[PDB]
Every structure is written in C-alpha cells, then in structure tokens.
C-alpha cells in the first residue's frame, strides 16, 4: 500500500494491498458511528496484524483509496494474456452470521450514498473473496471508495479482515463458492453408481479395508514427484518452522498457505518490496502437503511410541491450520487450479491417518474438503465411462489419489458403492479403443498422449494402473479382466520397443532423454501378480529381465520357478506410430514412417526445436543398454542425419521449426508404416511427402524409402528422390555416432579408420562397420560420404550451442538430379570377414537380393537369404510376380514360401481414422498367382487364381498359411 492509486497506468502491474504492517495503517480507513476499527495481532495472513471490524447490523467503515479501473483489454494487453483487474480479501468469522455483507464502490462514499457484491458470512474459519471488478459487480473511472457494509437483518457482530489487493489477475480463475457468485462456477462431483450394488457384508468390507492396507504399503516401503523425507529430526525443524499454535475459542495462528498458481493473483514479480518480504513469509501448498505425508510414513513406521505419538500431533496440528486457512468444503479460495500438483500427497496421507482422523472427529471435514477440491477432476472422478476416460495423465497423477478420496467416505454403504463404480471405470478406461486421437490403450500395443504414441505419457501410466489393479486384485473390486489382457497387450509391446530405453524415434519431444522400461519395471510385478491364475509367466519374466533377477530369485517373489525372460526375437508392426520394431540378438531396429494420423514430432516452444526428421523413414539400431554409451550423443549432434532418415541438411537456423511454439507436423497421406510376417520379418513402407507450402519445408521434397528386415539383417532401398534444387543436400543416412576410446573404430573395406579427422567417399561394392558392430553392404549408390569430425549442434531445448566428435556415413543423391535412388543391407552380426563373404555373394550375381521393382507405385525386395518377399504396394497395382498379382488398396504384403506351404500377410498402415473419427477396418483384396487352400483371412478360388480378402483393422496385420491345390 502506497499513496499512488490502484492500476496506477505508470505502474499497472503492480498490486495495491492493505496489510497493516506499514506506518499509521488505518490512515485510509474511517468507520461510521456504529462500528469500531482495530488491529489485532491474534490472527492474520499477511504480516502478523489483520483488521478487526465489530458493527451494529447496517453499519459501514470505508477504505479511501483512488482507482483507474482498466478494461479487460487494458489488462490483458500489460501482461500477455486473457486478463481482469480483481478485487481480493481474506475475511475470518469466530462465529456464523445469517445475511449478506455488501461491498460497494463509488467516488467520495459515506455511511448513506454505483456497483458492488456480497458476501454470505454464514461459515467459520477464512474464507477468500475474489472479483473481477469489470464482470462480477451489479464501473467509472473516478472510483476513490470501497465502503464495506455489514448486513441490515443482523443486530450485532465482530469480523476480522486482511489483505485487502488490487490486482490484475488471469480471468479463468476468479471461482464462485458459497460465499461469493462469480460469472465462473467449478461444478461439484456428482459420482455415478453402477448397478447391481455391492452390499455391506464382513467380506466386502474386509476387502476395502486391504485395498486401503495395500495401498499404504506401497507409500511405506521410491515414487517419481515426492519429495520424500524419512529424516524426523527434519520433519520436526520443518513443523517448527510454520509456527502453528491453537488458539483459546477455535482455530489457529500460523503461516498462511498458498497454493503454486494462487500467488498469481500477487503478480509477484511486480509487487513493490514491502509487499514482496510479506509474500515470502507464505508457505507452498505442495511444500506443507509433501511434509504431512512425510510425517504420516513416519508415524506408520515409527517403533518408538513417545515419538509415534508426537508424529501424530504434528499431522493434527497441520490438518487444523489447513482446515482453518479455508481449505473446505464451499471455500472456492478465488482458485485451486492445478490441485493435483498442490495436494497429491495429501490424499494419500488421510490412508496412512484414516484412523487418527477418525478418533480427532476430522475424517468428515478432511473428506468434504478433498472433494470439494477434488471438482475440477470432476470429468473423470464422477466415474462415468466416457471418450476422455482413458486419460494417460490421470492414471499417472489422479488415479491412487482418487481411489484415496473414494476410501475416505464415511457411509460403509456408500464407500463400497464408490469402489465398485471405480473398478468400472478403470475397467472399461483400459478396455475401451478411445476414437480419434483420445488417449489411451489401442488394439496394437500403442499408448496414447498428445494424440498419438508417447511412450514419455505412458510409462507413467502403465506403472499406475498396474499398481491399481494389483491393490484390487483377487477382491469383489478387482478390475475387469478386459483391462486385464489389454494393458498386458500395451505394457509386453512396450518391452518389445525398449532396450531398455525407447528408441530416437519415440523421444518425442525429447531426443536423448529416451523413458526406460527400469522406471516402469515394478509394474510387470503388479500386472503378472493380478492375472485371474496368477502368476502370469510372460509378464514375470519380463519383470525379472528388466529389474535384473536371477531365476534363483523368482520362487520367494512370484511363489514359483520363472526363468528371466530372454529379449524378444523376430518383427512387430506397430502402425499406431508407423513404426516397426525388427529384434536380433541383443539388438533393437526402430524403423518410424508418418502420416495423416501420426505426427513427424512433438516441437515445442523448448523442446525438440530441430526435431523436423525424428520420422523420416528412420532405422535407429539400438543394443541392449544405454544409447549414450552406444555413441547416441547429444552433443554436437548433427540433426539432419537421423540414422535411415532421407533428409535436405539444413542449416539449425532452417532446420528449426517455423511455428515458434507447437507444431506437430501430420503427414500428406494415409499409407506409410509397417507389417510383419511370421512376427520373425518385417517390411517398412514409407512415402515422404511435404506440405504444399510450409514455411522452411520444401513442397517438392519427395522419396519412396522401403526397407525389409529379417533374421541378422536389413535392406534399404529408394526411389523417386527429389527436391526443388535438383537433390542438393539431400542425403540417406547410414549411421551417425559419437567417437569415444570405447567408440573409437570404423572398418572400410577391411581397413581400421581411427583418425580424426577423415572423410573418403564410397560406391557400389564397398562396406563399412560402425563402432556399434553395424556392417552397412554398398549395393546402389554413385556417392556415399564418411566423415570422422569435429561437429557443431545446438541441445532441443534452449537452442545453446554443442559440439563433440563423431563418425557419420550418408549417401549424397545430389549426383543424381531427378529420381535419386539407393540401396544398402545392414548386417547387425557384422565383422571384417562376414562382410567380405557378404561382399563375395553380393558380386556373384547378387546371391543377397534382388529388387524386382523399384518406383512411385511398388516396391517389391526378394530377400535370398530368408526367402521372403516384400512388397509395398504405395498404390493400388497389377504386379507381375511368381506370387502377388494385384492389391486393390495402398497395402504392404510379404510371401514366405516352405517347403509345401504359401504364407500371405497384408495390411495397410493407413489406420483409416482422424483426429476425432474412430478407426473402421479396411477390406484389401490380394489377388495371388494359381489354385490354393489352407486365421480370419477369407479365400475364393477364381478361375486359375485366388482372392485373398485380408481385413485390416489399426493397422494390425493378418496372414495366411495356404497349401497349393492340384
Ligand atoms: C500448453 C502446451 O504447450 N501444450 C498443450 C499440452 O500440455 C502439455 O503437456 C502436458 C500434459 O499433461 O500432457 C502438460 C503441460 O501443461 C504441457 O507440457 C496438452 O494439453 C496438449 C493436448 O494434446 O496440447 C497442448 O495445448
Ligand atoms: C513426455 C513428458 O514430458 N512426460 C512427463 C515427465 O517427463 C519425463 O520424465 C522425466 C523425469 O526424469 O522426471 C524427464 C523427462 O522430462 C521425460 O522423459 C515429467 O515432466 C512428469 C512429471 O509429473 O510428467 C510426465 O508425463
Ligand atoms: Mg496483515
């Protein structure tokens, strides 16, 4: 409080508040005859005085205090966003009052005199006031009086008051409660109830008092966003700290609490410096609900019961003073958005103190009060099955805390009602396919956040809702077995394209920074423990490979011999990220396409800014363990040459994305990803298209990159590669790692590279192997470059500079200026002699593959080694072929002939859907060469050939095991 005017146009920003620890504090104030003005240093919320105001009923005392009251316009204008100027008390009753105080402002008021509001004064405790003074009166410029008049059909009364702010505020979060209307209500939990109930009987009951035991267990004996403290002689010095003492008639005094995004109505950075040292005294929500759990662990595990006894008094003082601080039921507090970052811990600290709370008679405040809260949840705590229920932030941040809510409900009847509706929810959150782009499970394996595959939103969500089904398994509340078998379907895919973290490919929007499966091995306990015949076998060995068990260790944990799982062989599509994922020995192939449906990248403000290329036909070969130590280096990562990729190498300042805050940049066509065969083959088939006019991106970049990985290797190949300068920069990647004296060597035709520098620059016939044991075989191409260099990036982030050493191999297709093709085989088993065999063959005829066609429509690869055929028919074709003769669809199709038997796949990637449309399954017709036999593959004999009618549902490939008729 300064004697410059509220909104000061000099100093818009800057809030005006009445505290009263400044100089003759009352100066501004006048009372009429009936009501007397004091400070009492008894209670407050800023500084250590507040405002105690005792009235004859119809009295009024005014703050004198000259207003220049802006627009919304005015206000969003000086601070950057949607804004409203806000008037803002706190007010305490020691007693109920039944009527109305009304605020009234207006120019030179008294006792007797444009708008105001009022107040229902009907409660006890704080409570906090908050209105936008442009849209929540009933205004001038010229406003010099704010006059505060107690109700008329009350006789008498006493109020204390504090901290009297105006303030520009953000104009989504002034919320009405029970004491104030607002254009803005956050409407309360109304909670769906599934039929038939369950009653309340010794068992049911039994099992909601375990699922609360489980559940504490798990909080008692390390959780990701918990600032865990097991010390008590810092939780104590941290209590002591706050300064709560219980005051003689109810209530306390303490450090007043404030939530992270409730200091915005401050504007804190625009406070003047009297103003600022009083903020800093606040205590953070989240700081004061973190020390409560922390001393509930404590008290559940403390021996000693001198001590046990002090950690429960602690906690009773803390629940009080947040009780007092207008933390309850129909206390708005002006907002609480973002609850869940400011009171997670708080919810599941009432499961470790259900039964102090019981015996101190504040289990039913400390309920009313949660749920209160707990209404900006309301889409998912209400419990109703709806398109948005899948949510894979709720199950990571929401869902224990709102299983804690539910067990906090006093009625035995009613708590059991919750439960059972909370296991139908869950159940039909992980059963569901959400349409469109909604988060969630998919029929594929795929998880989704941000409208499409994230392996960073899932993790998290998969270790949750595991923990969720395993504190209700073998209960009446034990989650369906649907949500059972498709989380399984999610979290054994994710084991398949980990290794153990994700690939590049699936970063999103953060390269280097790839989630592990370690962060999420808990879950395959949880998840192989809750099967309906428990322990599942797949699951357990995932579990012991992941947290790194012997066999000799999985009898005492899982109650049988379970050998650890070995790491998945052979080819899984997954087309919900048209991705693929191709395993050998200890090796991961991550092969990404895009399209429509699936974005190149998730680009950021800060995050992944030279990310253009993260989908652009890439192979990203990953061995069992860490990506750095495998040379995947951030620094000085060149960005353009994404290991498989065909991409035009840009400078950062054009690789950049154009949109300086999000874009997630969807492909031009329905068709590209992948399809397996056998699950031990795969074939990518991936058509790069660029927008007809987006800014840094060149509309006639094009190629048809397709690859097909089998057993020990891949084959690349290329076609119909253009650009606007005639294939200038545009490169095919090899590979691109850092050099260490651990990644220190390169082979080239035999010959051991460790220089640095050194470029040389290869063509047909030649090879090389990678630092990693990566062999790449020349088999089409004029120009392949290799460079051993010194290389300058920038980190995704912050766009800083980086730099360090790396060995690179790109093929440069500016050599050919219209249609630029390639082709390599990549050996993962690679040595010196294994290439120059592979070499040997490749010059006898070409005994590794032949390509059988190769441009805008089909690319079909006969693998000789495996003796499969790939064939990605970009469109629909007539082939001529020893097999395939026609697809009527944009398909991928593979052929394995054995001895006496045909084996068909087919699929398209397309997954036929939008952003909002559910995915239908799409019929393909594959015509195949002469009379056959034999799976949902249907099959009609026509004249000397066979219709194949294959159905493609997400993507999910099907096939076909035929045998041929005389
Ligand atoms: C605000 C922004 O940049 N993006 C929005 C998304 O929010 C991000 O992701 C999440 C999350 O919980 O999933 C939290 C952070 O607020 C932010 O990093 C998200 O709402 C998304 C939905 O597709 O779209 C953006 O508006
Ligand atoms: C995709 C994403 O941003 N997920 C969020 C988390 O980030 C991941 O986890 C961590 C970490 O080590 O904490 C670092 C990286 O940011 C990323 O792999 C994290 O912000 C979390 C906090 O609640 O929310 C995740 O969804
Ligand atoms: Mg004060």
Same mark, same amino acid.
């Given at each position: 409080?300064?004697?410059?005017?509220?909104?000061?146009?000099?100093?818009?920003?800057?809030?005006?508040?009445?505290?009263?620890?400044?100089?003759?504090?009352?100066?501004?104030?006048?009372?009429?005859?009936?009501?007397?003005?004091?400070?009492?240093?008894?209670?407050?919320?800023?500084?250590?005085?507040?405002?105690?105001?005792?009235?004859?009923?119809?009295?009024?005392?005014?703050?004198?205090?000259?207003?220049?009251?802006?627009?919304?316009?005015?206000?969003?204008?000086?601070?950057?966003?949607?804004?409203?100027?806000?008037?803002?008390?706190?007010?305490?009753?020691?007693?109920?009052?039944?009527?109305?105080?009304?605020?009234?402002?207006?120019?030179?008021?008294?006792?007797?005199?444009?708008?105001?509001?009022?107040?229902?004064?009907?409660?006890?405790?704080?409570?906090?006031?908050?209105?936008?003074?442009?849209?929540?009166?009933?205004?001038?410029?010229?406003?010099?009086?704010?006059?505060?008049?107690?109700?008329?059909?009350?006789?008498?009364?006493?109020?204390?008051?504090?901290?009297?702010?105006?303030?520009?505020?953000?104009?989504?979060?002034?919320?009405?409660?029970?004491?104030?209307?607002?254009?803005?209500?956050?409407?309360?939990?109304?909670?769906?109830?599934?039929?038939?109930?369950?009653?309340?009987?010794?068992?049911?009951?039994?099992?909601?008092?375990?699922?609360?035991?489980?559940?504490?267990?798990?909080?008692?004996?390390?959780?990701?966003?918990?600032?865990?403290?097991?010390?008590?002689?810092?939780?104590?010095?941290?209590?002591?700290?706050?300064?709560?003492?219980?005051?003689?008639?109810?209530?306390?005094?303490?450090?007043?609490?404030?939530?992270?995004?409730?200091?915005?109505?401050?504007?804190?950075?625009?406070?003047?410096?009297?103003?600022?040292?009083?903020?800093?005294?606040?205590?953070?929500?989240?700081?004061?609900?973190?020390?409560?759990?922390?001393?509930?662990?404590?008290?559940?595990?403390?021996?000693?019961?001198?001590?046990?006894?002090?950690?429960?008094?602690?906690?009773?003082?803390?629940?009080?003073?947040?009780?007092?601080?207008?933390?309850?039921?129909?206390?708005?507090?002006?907002?609480?958005?973002?609850?869940?970052?400011?009171?997670?811990?708080?919810?599941?600290?009432?499961?470790?103190?259900?039964?102090?709370?019981?015996?101190?008679?504040?289990?039913?405040?400390?309920?009313?009060?949660?749920?209160?809260?707990?209404?900006?949840?309301?889409?998912?705590?209400?419990?109703?099955?709806?398109?948005?229920?899948?949510?894979?932030?709720?199950?990571?941040?929401?869902?224990?805390?709102?299983?804690?809510?539910?067990?906090?409900?006093?009625?035995?009847?009613?708590?059991?009602?919750?439960?059972?509706?909370?296991?139908?929810?869950?159940?039909?959150?992980?059963?569901?396919?959400?349409?469109?782009?909604?988060?969630?499970?998919?029929?594929?394996?795929?998880?989704?956040?941000?409208?499409?595959?994230?392996?960073?939103?899932?993790?998290?969500?998969?270790?949750?809702?595991?923990?969720?089904?395993?504190?209700?398994?073998?209960?009446?509340?034990?989650?369906?077995?649907?949500?059972?078998?498709?989380?399984?379907?999610?979290?054994?895919?994710?084991?398949?394209?980990?290794?153990?973290?994700?690939?590049?490919?699936?970063?999103?929007?953060?390269?280097?920074?790839?989630?592990?499966?370690?962060?999420?091995?808990?879950?395959?306990?949880?998840?192989?423990?809750?099967?309906?015949?428990?322990?599942?076998?797949?699951?357990?060995?995932?579990?012991?490979?992941?947290?790194?068990?012997?066999?000799?260790?999985?009898?005492?944990?899982?109650?049988?011999?379970?050998?650890?799982?070995?790491?998945?062989?052979?080819?899984?599509?997954?087309?919900?990220?048209?991705?693929?994922?191709?395993?050998?020995?200890?090796?991961?192939?991550?092969?990404?396409?895009?399209?429509?449906?699936?974005?190149?990248?998730?680009?950021?403000?800060?995050?992944?800014?030279?990310?253009?290329?993260?989908?652009?036909?890439?192979?990203?070969?990953?061995?069992?363990?860490?990506?750095?130590?495998?040379?995947?280096?951030?620094?000085?990562?060149?960005?353009?040459?994404?290991?498989?990729?065909?991409?035009?190498?840009?400078?950062?300042?054009?690789?950049?994305?154009?949109?300086?805050?999000?874009?997630?940049?969807?492909?031009?066509?329905?068709?590209?990803?992948?399809?397996?065969?056998?699950?031990?083959?795969?074939?990518?088939?991936?058509?790069?298209?660029?927008?007809?006019?987006?800014?840094?991106?060149?509309?006639?970049?094009?190629?048809?990159?397709?690859?097909?990985?089998?057993?020990?290797?891949?084959?690349?190949?290329?076609?119909?590669?253009?650009?606007?300068?005639?294939?200038?920069?545009?490169?095919?990647?090899?590979?691109?790692?850092?050099?260490?004296?651990?990644?220190?060597?390169?082979?080239?035709?035999?010959?051991?590279?460790?220089?640095?520098?050194?470029?040389? $620059?290869?063509? !047909?016939? *030649?090879? #090389? =192997?990678? %630092?990693?044991?990566?062999?790449? @075989?020349?088999?089409?191409?004029? +120009?392949?470059?290799?460079?051993?260099?010194?290389?300058?990036?920038?980190?995704?982030?912050?766009?800083?500079?980086?730099?360090?050493?790396?060995?690179?191999?790109?093929?440069?297709?500016?050599?050919?200026?219209?249609?630029?093709?390639?082709?390599?085989?990549?050996?993962?088993?690679?040595?010196?002699?294994?290439?120059?065999?592979?070499?040997?063959?490749?010059?006898?005829?070409?005994?590794?593959?032949?390509?059988?066609?190769?441009?805008?429509?089909?690319?079909?690869?006969?693998?000789?080694?495996?003796?499969?055929?790939?064939?990605?028919?970009?469109?629909?074709?007539?082939?001529?072929?020893?097999?395939?003769?026609?697809?009527?669809?944009?398909?991928?199709?593979? $052929?394995?002939? !054995?001895? *006496?038997? #045909? =084996?068909? %796949?087919?699929?398209?990637?397309? @997954?036929?859907?939008?952003?909002? +449309?559910?995915?239908?399954?799409?019929?393909?017709?594959?015509?195949?060469?002469?009379?056959?036999?034999?799976?949902?593959?249907?099959?009609?004999?026509?004249?000397?050939?066979?219709?194949?009618?294959?159905?493609?549902?997400?993507?999910?490939?099907?096939?076909?095991?035929?045998?041929?008729?005389?």
């Amino acid at each position: 409080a300064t004697s410059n005017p509220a909104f000061d146009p000099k100093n818009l920003m800057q809030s005006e508040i009445y505290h009263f620890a400044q100089n003759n504090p009352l100066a501004d104030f006048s009372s009429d005859k009936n009501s007397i003005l004091t400070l009492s240093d008894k209670r407050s919320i800023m500084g250590n005085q507040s405002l105690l105001w005792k009235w004859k009923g119809g009295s009024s005392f005014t703050l004198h205090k000259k207003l220049i009251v802006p627009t919304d316009k005015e206000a969003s204008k000086a601070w950057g966003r949607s804004s409203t100027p806000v008037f803002s008390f706190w007010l305490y009753n020691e007693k109920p009052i039944d009527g109305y105080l009304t605020i009234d402002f207006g120019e030179k008021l008294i006792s007797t005199s444009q708008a105001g509001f009022k107040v229902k004064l009907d409660f006890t405790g704080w409570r906090a006031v908050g209105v936008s003074l442009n849209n929540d009166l009933e205004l001038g410029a010229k406003v010099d009086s704010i006059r505060f008049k107690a109700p008329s059909n009350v006789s008498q009364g006493e109020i204390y008051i504090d901290r009297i702010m105006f303030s520009v505020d953000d104009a989504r979060y002034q919320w009405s409660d029970y004491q104030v209307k607002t254009r803005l209500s956050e409407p309360e939990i109304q909670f769906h109830n599934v039929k038939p109930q369950l009653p309340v009987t010794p068992e049911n009951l039994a099992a909601i008092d375990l699922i609360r035991q489980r559940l504490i267990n798990e909080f008692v004996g390390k959780e990701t966003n918990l600032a865990l403290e097991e010390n008590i002689s810092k939780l104590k010095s941290d209590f002591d700290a706050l300064n709560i003492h219980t005051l003689a008639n109810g209530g306390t005094q303490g450090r007043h609490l404030i939530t992270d995004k409730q200091i915005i109505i401050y504007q804190p950075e625009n406070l003047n410096s009297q103003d600022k040292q009083l903020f800093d005294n606040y205590v953070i929500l989240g700081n004061y609900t973190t020390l409560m759990f922390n001393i509930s662990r404590a008290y559940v595990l403390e021996k000693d019961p001198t001590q046990k006894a002090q950690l429960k008094q602690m906690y009773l003082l803390m629940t009080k003073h947040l009780l007092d601080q207008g933390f309850v039921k129909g206390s708005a507090l002006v907002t609480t958005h973002h609850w869940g970052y400011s009171s997670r811990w708080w919810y599941i600290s009432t499961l470790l103190m259900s039964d102090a709370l019981k015996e101190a008679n504040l289990q039913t405040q400390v309920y009313d009060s949660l749920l209160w809260y707990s209404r900006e949840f309301k889409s998912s705590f209400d419990m109703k099955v709806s398109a948005d229920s899948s949510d894979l932030d709720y199950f990571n941040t929401l869902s224990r805390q709102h299983l804690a809510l539910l067990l906090l409900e006093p009625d035995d009847q009613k708590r059991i009602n919750l439960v059972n509706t909370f296991s139908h929810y869950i159940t039909g959150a992980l059963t569901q396919v959400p349409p469109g782009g909604k988060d969630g499970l998919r029929p594929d394996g795929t998880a989704w956040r941000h409208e499409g595959n994230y392996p960073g939103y899932s993790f998290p969500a998969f270790k949750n809702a595991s923990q969720l089904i395993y504190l209700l398994r073998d209960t009446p509340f034990s989650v369906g077995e649907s949500g059972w078998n498709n989380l399984k379907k999610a979290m054994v895919s994710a084991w398949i394209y980990s290794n153990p973290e994700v690939g590049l490919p699936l970063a999103g929007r953060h390269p280097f920074n790839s989630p592990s499966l370690k962060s999420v091995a808990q879950g395959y306990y949880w998840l192989a423990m809750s099967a309906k015949s428990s322990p599942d076998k797949t699951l357990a060995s995932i579990y012991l490979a992941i947290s790194d068990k012997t066999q000799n260790e999985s009898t005492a944990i899982f109650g049988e011999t379970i050998t650890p799982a070995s790491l998945p062989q052979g080819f899984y599509a997954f087309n919900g990220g048209a991705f693929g994922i191709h395993r050998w020995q200890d090796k991961m192939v991550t092969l990404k396409a895009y399209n429509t449906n699936v974005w190149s990248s998730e680009i950021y403000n800060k995050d992944n800014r030279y990310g253009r290329y993260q989908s652009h036909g890439v192979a990203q070969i990953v061995s069992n363990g860490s990506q750095l130590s495998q040379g995947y280096q951030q620094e000085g990562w060149d960005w353009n040459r994404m290991q498989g990729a065909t991409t035009i190498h840009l400078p950062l300042k054009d690789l950049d994305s154009p949109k300086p805050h999000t874009l997630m940049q969807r492909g031009e066509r329905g068709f590209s990803g992948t399809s397996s065969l056998e699950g031990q083959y795969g074939m990518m088939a991936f058509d790069l298209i660029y927008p007809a006019n987006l800014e840094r991106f060149d509309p006639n970049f094009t190629a048809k990159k397709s690859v097909l990985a089998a057993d020990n290797h891949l084959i690349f190949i290329g076609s119909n590669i253009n650009s606007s300068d005639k294939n200038k920069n545009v490169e095919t990647t090899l590979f691109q790692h850092a050099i260490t004296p651990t990644l220190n060597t390169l082979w080239i035709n035999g010959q051991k590279i460790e220089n640095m520098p050194y470029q040389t $620059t290869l063509q !047909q016939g *030649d090879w #090389l =192997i990678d %630092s990693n044991g990566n062999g790449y @075989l020349i088999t089409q191409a004029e +120009k392949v470059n290799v460079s051993r260099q010194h290389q300058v990036s920038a980190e995704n982030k912050n766009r800083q500079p980086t730099e360090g050493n790396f060995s690179s191999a790109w093929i440069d297709h500016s050599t050919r200026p219209k249609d630029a093709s390639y082709e390599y085989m990549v050996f993962l088993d690679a040595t010196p002699e294994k290439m120059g065999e592979m070499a040997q063959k490749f010059r006898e005829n070409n005994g590794l593959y032949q390509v059988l066609r190769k441009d805008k429509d089909v690319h079909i690869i006969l693998d000789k080694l495996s003796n499969v055929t790939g064939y990605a028919f970009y469109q629909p074709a007539s082939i001529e072929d020893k097999w395939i003769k026609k697809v009527n669809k944009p398909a991928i199709v593979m $052929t394995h002939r !054995q001895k *006496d038997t #045909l =084996i068909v %796949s087919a699929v398209t990637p397309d @997954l036929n859907m939008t952003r909002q +449309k559910a995915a239908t399954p799409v019929t393909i017709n594959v015509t195949i060469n002469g009379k056959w036999q034999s799976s949902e593959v249907k099959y009609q004999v026509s004249g000397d050939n066979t219709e194949l009618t294959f159905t493609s549902y997400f993507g999910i490939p099907q096939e076909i095991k035929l045998s041929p008729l005389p």
